[PDB]
Design a protein around this ligand. Sequence first.
Ligand SMILES: CCCCCCCCCCCCCC(=O)OC[C@H](COP(=O)(O)OCC(O)COP(=O)(O)OC[C@@H](COC(=O)CCCCCCCCCCCCC)OC(=O)CCCCCCCCCCCCC)OC(=O)CCCCCCCCCCCCC
Ligand code: BCL
Ligand SMILES: CC[C@H]1c2cc3[nH]c4c(c3C)C(=O)[C@H](C(=O)OC)c4c3nc(cc4[nH]c(cc(n2)[C@@H]1C)c(C(C)=O)c4C)[C@@H](C)[C@@H]3CCC(=O)OC/C=C(\C)CCC[C@H](C)CCC[C@H](C)CCCC(C)C
Ligand SMILES: CC[C@H]1c2cc3[nH]c4c(c3C)C(=O)[C@H](C(=O)OC)c4c3nc(cc4[nH]c(cc(n2)[C@@H]1C)c(C(C)=O)c4C)[C@@H](C)[C@@H]3CCC(=O)OC/C=C(\C)CCC[C@H](C)CCC[C@H](C)CCCC(C)C
Ligand SMILES: COC(C)(C)C/C=C/C(C)=C/C=C/C(C=O)=C/C=C/C(C)=C/C=C/C=C(C)/C=C/C=C(\C)CC/C=C(C)/C=C/C=C(\C)C(=O)O
Ligand SMILES: COC(C)(C)C/C=C/C(C)=C/C=C/C(C=O)=C/C=C/C(C)=C/C=C/C=C(C)/C=C/C=C(\C)CC/C=C(C)/C=C/C=C(\C)C(=O)O
Ligand SMILES: COC(C)(C)C/C=C/C(C)=C/C=C/C(C=O)=C/C=C/C(C)=C/C=C/C=C(C)/C=C/C=C(\C)CC/C=C(C)/C=C/C=C(\C)C(=O)O
Ligand SMILES: COC(C)(C)C/C=C/C(C)=C/C=C/C(C=O)=C/C=C/C(C)=C/C=C/C=C(C)/C=C/C=C(\C)CC/C=C(C)/C=C/C=C(\C)C(=O)O
Ligand SMILES: COC(C)(C)C/C=C/C(C)=C/C=C/C(C=O)=C/C=C/C(C)=C/C=C/C=C(C)/C=C/C=C(\C)CC/C=C(C)/C=C/C=C(\C)C(=O)O
Ligand SMILES: COC(C)(C)C/C=C/C(C)=C/C=C/C(C)=C/C=C/C(C)=C/C=C\C=C(C)\C=C\C=C(C)\C=C\C=C(C)\C=C\CC(C)(C)OC
Ligand SMILES: CCCCCCCCCCCCO[C@@H]1O[C@H](CO)[C@@H](O[C@H]2O[C@H](CO)[C@@H](O)[C@H](O)[C@H]2O)[C@H](O)[C@H]1O
Ligand SMILES: CCCCCCCCCCCCO[C@@H]1O[C@H](CO)[C@@H](O[C@H]2O[C@H](CO)[C@@H](O)[C@H](O)[C@H]2O)[C@H](O)[C@H]1O
Lengths: 273, 55, 176, 60, 60, 60, 60, 60, 56, 60, 39, 39, 39, 39, 39, 39, 62, 170
Amino acid sequence: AMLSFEKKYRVRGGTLIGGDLFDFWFGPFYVGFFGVTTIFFVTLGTLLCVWGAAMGPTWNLWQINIAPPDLKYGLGLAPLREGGLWQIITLCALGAFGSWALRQAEIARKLGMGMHIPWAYGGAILAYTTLVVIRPFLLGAWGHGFPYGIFSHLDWVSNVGYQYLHFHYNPAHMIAVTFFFTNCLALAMHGSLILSVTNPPKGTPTGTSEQENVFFRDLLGYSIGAIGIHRLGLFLAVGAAVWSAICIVISGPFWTQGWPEWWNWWLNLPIWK
Amino acid sequence: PTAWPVDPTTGQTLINGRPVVGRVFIMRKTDGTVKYPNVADVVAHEALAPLPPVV
Amino acid sequence: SDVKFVPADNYNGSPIIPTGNPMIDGVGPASWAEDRRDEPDLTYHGSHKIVPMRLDPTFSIAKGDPDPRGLPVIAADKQVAGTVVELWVNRSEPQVSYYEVQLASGERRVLLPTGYVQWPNFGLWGNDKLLVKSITAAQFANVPATKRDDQITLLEEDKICAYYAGGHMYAFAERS
Amino acid sequence: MHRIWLMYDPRRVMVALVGFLAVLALVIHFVLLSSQRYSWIENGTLGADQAPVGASAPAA
Amino acid sequence: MHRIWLMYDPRRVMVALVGFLAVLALVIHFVLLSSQRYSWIENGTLGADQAPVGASAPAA
Amino acid sequence: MHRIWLMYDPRRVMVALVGFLAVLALVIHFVLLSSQRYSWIENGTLGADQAPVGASAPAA
Amino acid sequence: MHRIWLMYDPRRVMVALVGFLAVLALVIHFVLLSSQRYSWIENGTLGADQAPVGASAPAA
Amino acid sequence: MHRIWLMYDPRRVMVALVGFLAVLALVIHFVLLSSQRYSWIENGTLGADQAPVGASAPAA
Amino acid sequence: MHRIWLMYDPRRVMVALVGFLAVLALVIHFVLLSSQRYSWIENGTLGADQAPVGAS
Amino acid sequence: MHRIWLMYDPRRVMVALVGFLAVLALVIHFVLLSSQRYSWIENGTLGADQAPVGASAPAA
Amino acid sequence: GMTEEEARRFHGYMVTGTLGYVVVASVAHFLAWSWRPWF
Amino acid sequence: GMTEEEARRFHGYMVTGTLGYVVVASVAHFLAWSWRPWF
Amino acid sequence: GMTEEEARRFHGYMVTGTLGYVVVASVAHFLAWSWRPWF
Amino acid sequence: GMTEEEARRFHGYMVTGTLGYVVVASVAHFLAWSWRPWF
Amino acid sequence: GMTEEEARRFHGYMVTGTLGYVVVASVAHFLAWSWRPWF
Amino acid sequence: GMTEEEARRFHGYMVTGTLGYVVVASVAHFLAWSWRPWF
Amino acid sequence: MMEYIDGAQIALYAFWLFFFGLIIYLRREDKREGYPLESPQGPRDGWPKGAPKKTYVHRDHG
Amino acid sequence: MLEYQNLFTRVQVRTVPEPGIFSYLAGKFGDAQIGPIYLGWAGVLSLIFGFIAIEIIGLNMWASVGWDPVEFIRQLPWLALEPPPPQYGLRVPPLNQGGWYLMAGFFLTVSIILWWIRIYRRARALQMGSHLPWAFASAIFLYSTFFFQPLLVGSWSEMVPFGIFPHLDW
Ligand SMILES: CCCCCCCCCCCCCC(=O)OC[C@H](COP(=O)(O)OCC(O)COP(=O)(O)OC[C@@H](COC(=O)CCCCCCCCCCCCC)OC(=O)CCCCCCCCCCCCC)OC(=O)CCCCCCCCCCCCC
Ligand code: BCL
Ligand SMILES: CC[C@H]1c2cc3[nH]c4c(c3C)C(=O)[C@H](C(=O)OC)c4c3nc(cc4[nH]c(cc(n2)[C@@H]1C)c(C(C)=O)c4C)[C@@H](C)[C@@H]3CCC(=O)OC/C=C(\C)CCC[C@H](C)CCC[C@H](C)CCCC(C)C
Ligand SMILES: CC[C@H]1c2cc3[nH]c4c(c3C)C(=O)[C@H](C(=O)OC)c4c3nc(cc4[nH]c(cc(n2)[C@@H]1C)c(C(C)=O)c4C)[C@@H](C)[C@@H]3CCC(=O)OC/C=C(\C)CCC[C@H](C)CCC[C@H](C)CCCC(C)C
Ligand SMILES: COC(C)(C)C/C=C/C(C)=C/C=C/C(C=O)=C/C=C/C(C)=C/C=C/C=C(C)/C=C/C=C(\C)CC/C=C(C)/C=C/C=C(\C)C(=O)O
Ligand SMILES: COC(C)(C)C/C=C/C(C)=C/C=C/C(C=O)=C/C=C/C(C)=C/C=C/C=C(C)/C=C/C=C(\C)CC/C=C(C)/C=C/C=C(\C)C(=O)O
Ligand SMILES: COC(C)(C)C/C=C/C(C)=C/C=C/C(C=O)=C/C=C/C(C)=C/C=C/C=C(C)/C=C/C=C(\C)CC/C=C(C)/C=C/C=C(\C)C(=O)O
Ligand SMILES: COC(C)(C)C/C=C/C(C)=C/C=C/C(C=O)=C/C=C/C(C)=C/C=C/C=C(C)/C=C/C=C(\C)CC/C=C(C)/C=C/C=C(\C)C(=O)O
Ligand SMILES: COC(C)(C)C/C=C/C(C)=C/C=C/C(C=O)=C/C=C/C(C)=C/C=C/C=C(C)/C=C/C=C(\C)CC/C=C(C)/C=C/C=C(\C)C(=O)O
Ligand SMILES: COC(C)(C)C/C=C/C(C)=C/C=C/C(C)=C/C=C/C(C)=C/C=C\C=C(C)\C=C\C=C(C)\C=C\C=C(C)\C=C\CC(C)(C)OC
Ligand SMILES: CCCCCCCCCCCCO[C@@H]1O[C@H](CO)[C@@H](O[C@H]2O[C@H](CO)[C@@H](O)[C@H](O)[C@H]2O)[C@H](O)[C@H]1O
Ligand SMILES: CCCCCCCCCCCCO[C@@H]1O[C@H](CO)[C@@H](O[C@H]2O[C@H](CO)[C@@H](O)[C@H](O)[C@H]2O)[C@H](O)[C@H]1O
């Protein structure tokens, strides 16, 4: 089925690989070559997660836990029953997430859009790749990855935090948190402003860019403008994930003490040592 | 209780009185993990409750 | 048959194929919202939101920026398509919305949405010409017209922007 | 039966089939390679009288 | 009864049906393979007298 | 009663009914398979007297 | 009293009602299944005097 | 009093009322169900002199 | 037979085949390299009687 | 046979080939450098019978 | 929207359906009570 | 949408399918009951 | 759209395929029951 | 779109490739069975 | 597109290249099997 | 777009460079084997 | 006196019923443009059915 | 940084007179004044209450390093104004043992509420929906639970300390 304006847009072209062979739709979805590779990796990676649940202790959704290998296996593939399955699923996940971004690039090209959406999603892929490839590689064992399980990965986050005694003191983490919180504020403001001009009190004319510009200036003391608020949202949201990736990759590979004692440099500046 | 009987003739494991061809192992889930039954069972593995404070 | 396109084949979810020139007919990334209201957009006080700068002396180029007027416009085929005669401005959110281009080797003047222009060296230095990467200097002749030269309708905005949007797919193609 | 190829485009049914067979073959091999009895890379040289067999605890 | 195919496009029903049956078949196999009694890759060579049975109620 | 099919499109109702009944059936089976008494894959061969039963009130 | 169907579209209300009753029933069943006294899947075969009762006021 | 139905659309007030009454009824039922004295699903069959009572004042 | 190449451009299939086979070869080597029996970089000089077997 | 270079732009193929070989060479060198047997920077001067060997099979 | 006589006709089905449902629920509570009373 | 003749025709199948489903479920419950009663 | 003649032709295939599949699944259960009964 | 003649021509290869693939799988299963039976 | 005589030409190369690759791989397995058999 | 005679001369270098690369790798492996063999 | 049922669990299902109600509402709002869908065998509404297309009252200036 | 639209790369424009029929209007959209940053009565009061709250926090931090202005900057992220001791429960505590804390918490809370009034009044005056005030109300709801949860457990000692690293310790 198609939107009442859609058919006009369903042309060939814009594919990065495979020419016309995969250039077609399946219901709402565009396929394309990276559509095919997406479904391959999604299906394989999902069915291996189901197998990980089957050979584990329970089917309870919250408790399923596909753990990485012991650190003693280093950068090798463990026995599948001992974390090797987690490694294969990780390769599936990387394949899926990469295919998804490249498929989005084909869709954007076919509509004459800029590439902004694939690159924004690249920020999430970077954070994932840091957690399961780059940081475990710099530490020398794939077992430093997080387990695939809805609550068991929160146990991993907890224990990694306390490996540095007081993870709140991580300086890059403070920046990343500030981006996440400021992003949520900015999203609430932008959402509210657009809705409040397009949905005024009953018996009131539809508002204008001038009214939202005036109200925004009353809120922040300056006028961001229509292009600017979307630039700011993208900057805050993607910047949050980039600073997240930084804050975890420095924890272990680069800094190994508690995070509070990192701040010793500030206390020892020569103006006040 | 820990292993099935072994036939002295052949070194061969007997399950419910009849031989198995192969080397028998007791099946377990990943790393021998077992779902926690309830709060009371978790608490029964812990130390007793802390004593009242000295104020 | 005036119908702008036909299915590539009979299976579900197959692409369409344009019959005529997709940039003129408006197919795929060259298409526009054909039911869009054919009226000017308005400021809060009800004046025309997008107008040529000569109609509102409130507006002027920020000092130490180049005025783009009189510069040549270089198309995707490196040909000189024309020269900038006028700027159109958004009066609700002050910015340049369109360049107006006097066509080289032609009678006509056409609008050019600034999203499709770029400066050499991205404006940092030089600034002696404008680059339009999306269409050839021949295709500049077919850019849609506005009914009047003092105002532009929302439909005309959609038509003009859709023309340059399609170029990145169709400008260097025999599909015309 | 051949009229199924009028309902569906054979060019992309075949992609769906080959993709299905690839995923299914890989899943079955990884399931076996996880098992103890069929972890053939480590233990494939064992004869059937030495190959692992799983049982429940003897439940005295 | 054939008029159900005037109401639904058979080309869509076969897709829904194959999708449903593939998921359902895989669900059941993995559920069984996760059990003790039907973990057939490890224990399939046991006879029905030897295969696991879950615990009874208390004997009195 | 049949004019319910003028009030609602039967093609939409049947899809909704099938979706409801499929989800409901799966829910009930998963509830039973989660229980002790009806963990039938492990314990289905037990007789009705041997099958688990929940605790009664403590007799004074 | 029938004029309420001028005020509300009956084909919206009838679906809203089916949704309400579905959720309400599932809530009451899951609440009862979570109790001690009425977890009928485990303990449904107990007689009424054998079924659990919550603790009284302690006599003292 | 009826001018209330001119001041506000009865369709809005009806939904607001039913929403209020349902939310209030649910709050009260679960508050009682959470209490000791009125946890009727577990202890509903207790007589009134057997039902729990909160602690009295010290030293009469 | 040959009409398969009228459906699928052999120029493209041949690239996708190379990509598939390269990934598959890498996966099979890394599986074997990490096993005990076939860890040939550490133990390849062992004789087939000396090589590990996963009995337990 | 040289007509293969009409199928693909050699300018593109050579860039892909050099990339593949460069990554492959770095991967193999890193695998060897990380091993025990071939950690040649620290141990390259050891004679072949002094170089590490992985564990053998148990005697029984 | 409905005419008043459509609303009249629907209301007859709607009331009958509600009462028939409450009757079936009444038998369910009869059965449930006789199996395990809650008071 | 449907004519009232189509609605009438469809309803006959719908009731027959519903009866057939309820019959199979009734046998399924009696098999379950005789294997392991829940009351 | 689809002709009633075409719907009747497809129905012949669809019923036959459904019943064939159920027959093969019936044999699969016969084998599984002979190997390890679940009741 | 392909003719019903081309459909029959394609279907002949599809059946034949399916049979060949099933034959190979059958021999592979009987090799696997002889090495290490699963029932 | 491609003509059927180009397809018949390429099919010759593809079959030959595929089978030559399988031959080389079969020899590699013969070497690996002689070195350390997996069954 | 490359001509067939440009391809003809290009391929000769491609074969030559590949052969040279394989020759250097073959000596590199034989040196490594003499230093510390892996079988 | 309920052992398993507790206030946090009660609150959480109260939220779930609200949240799924919100998702239904949001999907109705998503369908004010481009619906009903076009297909062979006619128009399609999806689920939930969309709210109607919305007209906006302009400000007068005369 | 460089950007993928020309729109403000170069040839940005100056309205030398005001926009609204860079520069800004001095007029009204209806009854709403358009020139200055809006305050009204609630905005003015919010700034006074919020200023004294921030001033109490800063002065307690500065007193805690013994008025040393070098240590006030050097140690700033570790400084706090701290809640009362646990033994007081909800009773009024000594001034140097959480009395200033509850005072700053009160003045900050009133300042926040008055800022919500300001935003609510301004949205109405600009003839806009109340979406933004209710969005801000959701943030105020979370903030208020740092009062109500300490209240419900019965001790002001459970409140969040005012301080950069100290509130993260909490
Ligand atoms: C926790 C906080 C954050 C949590 C954050 C959570 C965010 C959730 C965002 C996703 C929700 C929207 C998804 C959506 O609308 O997809 C379109 C699709 C179809 O409707 P349509 O698009 O308007 O119409 C098209 C269709 O009619 C005809 O299209 P066509 O013929 O071309 O293609 C075939 C059909 C076949 O339908 C399907 O295959 C879809 C069936 C599965 C839908 C599951 C949706 C997710 C439910 C989540 C709620 C819960 C389910 C339990 O159409 C399609 O091909 C459409 C494909 C859409 C694929 C969407 C997949 C989304 C997966 C989301 C997973 C979320 C995981 C969290 O919609 C539906 O099928 C109905 C979904 C309605 C919303 C769910 C509301 C649930 C309320 C509670 C139960 C209500 C019981 C009645
Ligand atoms: C259009 C038909 C009318 C109607 C007309 C009648 C008539 C006439 C009689 C009853 C009778 C009864 N109705 Mg009735 N009844 C209606 C709707 C209902 C509903 C409901 C949920 O809407 C319910 C719960 C009942 C319930 C009852 C019982 C109290 C009682 C006997 C059992 C019975 O009929 O069982 C439930 C049955 C149904 C829901 C199906 C509809 C009614 C059936 C067809 C009546 C058959 C039995 C009747 C005695 C036959 C008449 C001939 C005799 C030789 C005198 N009726 C509908 C709206 N009902 C009888 C009575 O008063 O006994 C004391 C009686 O004589
Ligand atoms: C820029 C940074 C932020 C960001 C942005 C972002 N995310 C995006 C996009 C963008 C711009 C998309 O365009 C893309 C999209 O299409 O959204 C609809 C996407 C998306 N962000 C997603 C999720 C997501 N984003 C997250 C975060 C972020 N997204 C950042 C905060 C998180 C977090 C923090 O937890 C999640 C869960 C998806 C909804 C979607 C990408 C969909 C996609 O890639 O689909 C293909 C793959 C699958 C459908 C399934 C793959 C299954 C695997 C093979 C097996 C499972 C492996 C997995 C590792 C198991 C983990 C278990 C957990 C319990 C740990
Ligand atoms: C939906 C949830 C998110 C959210 C939303 C949100 N917050 C909001 C809003 C919204 C929608 C607003 O509209 C509102 C706002 O104004 O935004 C600009 C606000 C706001 N969110 C704020 C902060 C904030 N939001 C946060 C978080 C969040 N906000 C969530 C992520 C956080 C975090 C993560 O910790 C913080 C710190 C504020 C910037 C602002 C509310 C401002 C306010 O209430 O100010 C009160 C006033 C003072 C503290 C006094 C200041 C005193 C001056 C420094 C003194 C100067 C001297 C003075 C002039 C003297 C007096 C003289 C008189 C004569 C005048
Ligand atoms: C926590 O509690 C827990 C533990 C979960 C416990 C509690 C569980 C609960 C609360 C359960 C509730 C269950 C329930 C409530 O109502 C259940 C209600 C179930 C119902 C109604 C089932 C109905 C099934 C009907 C079927 C299958 C119909 C099939 C019809 C067919 C095949 C014919 C199709 C038409 C044809 C062929 C004609 C085409 C002609 C055409 C087109 C023409 O002529 O044009
Ligand atoms: C763990 O325990 C849990 C899992 C929890 C327990 C619970 C389990 C549950 C709830 C199970 C539910 C099961 C279920 C419910 O419905 C199962 C229902 C299954 C069904 C109905 C299967 C039907 C299969 C039908 C098939 C295969 C049809 C094949 C058709 C063919 C081959 C013909 C195609 C057309 C051709 C060739 C030509 C067309 C010509 C044309 C067009 C022309 O000529 O024009
Ligand atoms: C862990 O245990 C778990 C996993 C859980 C257990 C469960 C497992 C489950 C559920 C398994 C299910 C399996 C299954 C179910 O159906 C499996 C079904 C498999 C099937 C159907 C395989 C079919 C293969 C067919 C092939 C290979 C065809 C090849 C065709 C060829 C070569 C010819 C190509 C055309 C040519 C050459 C020329 C065309 C002419 C043209 C163009 C012309 O002339 O124009
Ligand atoms: C324990 O680990 C796990 C992983 C779990 C275990 C399991 C693994 C599994 C399941 C593996 C499955 C593998 C598999 C499945 O099918 C593997 C299938 C492999 C296949 C199909 C290989 C095919 C190779 C074909 C080749 C190389 C062809 C070369 C052709 C050449 C060179 C000629 C090119 C053309 C020319 C020159 C002419 C141009 C025209 C010209 C010049 C002109 O026109 O002039
Ligand atoms: C840990 O163990 C793991 C790693 C897991 C185990 C390993 C596993 C795997 C999978 C290994 C795979 C190996 C492999 C598979 O393919 C390896 C394949 C290798 C190959 C093919 C190498 C090819 C080299 C070719 C070269 C260098 C060519 C050079 C050409 C030159 C110099 C001439 C260029 C042109 C010029 C100068 C100008 C011409 C004239 C022109 C233009 C004119 O005249 O115009
Ligand atoms: C000279 O001027 C100087 C130099 C001093 C000015 C400089 C000041 C500086 C440098 C200030 C620095 C301030 C900093 C760094 C502040 C950091 C604050 C942070 C990070 C705060 C974080 C969280 C705080 C929370 C959540 C506090 C919540 C408190 C609440 C909700 C309190 C509510 C109290 C109420 C409602 C009522 C209390 C009164 C009673 C109990 C009596 O009820 C009526
Ligand atoms: C009726 C819904 C089905 C579920 C409820 C089952 C309990 C009722 C058993 C059936 C008894 C007869 O039930 C009765 O049916 C007739 C039509 O047949 C309905 O009659 C309704 O429609 C008819 C026209 O069709 C109108 O003239 C009448 O005024 C109106 O009430 C009655 O409202 C209902 O009371
Ligand atoms: C993948 C690397 C491993 C080695 C792979 C290849 C090993 C075997 C190579 C054998 C070479 C001879 O093999 C044979 O070559 C000739 C051309 O010479 C091909 O011939 C093909 O091209 C010629 C000329 O374009 C056509 O006339 C002919 O109809 C067509 O079949 C044959 O189809 C192939 O069977």
